[PDB]
């Protein structure tokens, strides 16, 4: 029907102040939560993810025909997160914190 290597939902917010995203992740009391978002330009996105008592937005760029995740060029933002669900991102966090809290699972 309408599945895809994109589309879907709940992991990329396209509209909010670049600094209000720090207050939405600061309002949530817990260690570990990853999300993605769109900057104020269609030439770069950003992974908003906090851990412990700190917040860590991340800036991903897009080349004319590919994407620069950070140290490698990936084929798309969905395949990026696909092998990234198993690999680390920064020196400690990953996509290991989906909806997380004592009342999640």
């Amino acid at each position: 029907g309408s599945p895809g290597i994109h589309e879907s939902k709940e992991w990329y917010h396209a509209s909010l102040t670049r600094a209000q995203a720090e207050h939405m992740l600061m309002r949530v009391p817990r260690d570990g939560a990853f999300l993605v978002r769109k900057r104020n330009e269609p030439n770069s996105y950003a992974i908003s993810f906090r851990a412990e008592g700190k917040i860590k937005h991340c800036r991903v760029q897009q080349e004319g025909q590919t994407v620069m995740l950070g140290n490698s060029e990936f084929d798309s933002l969905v395949d990026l997160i696909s092998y990234y669900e198993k690999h680390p991102l920064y020196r400690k966090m990953k996509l290991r914190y989906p909806i997380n809290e004592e009342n999640s699972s």
Binding site: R18, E22, K54, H57, L69, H87
Partner: peptide, 12 residues
């Protein structure tokens, strides 16, 4: 400063 971190999985 903590408003963006380049996503690198350990410096190796």
């Amino acid at each position: 400063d903590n408003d963006y971190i380049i996503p690198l999985p350990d410096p190796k």
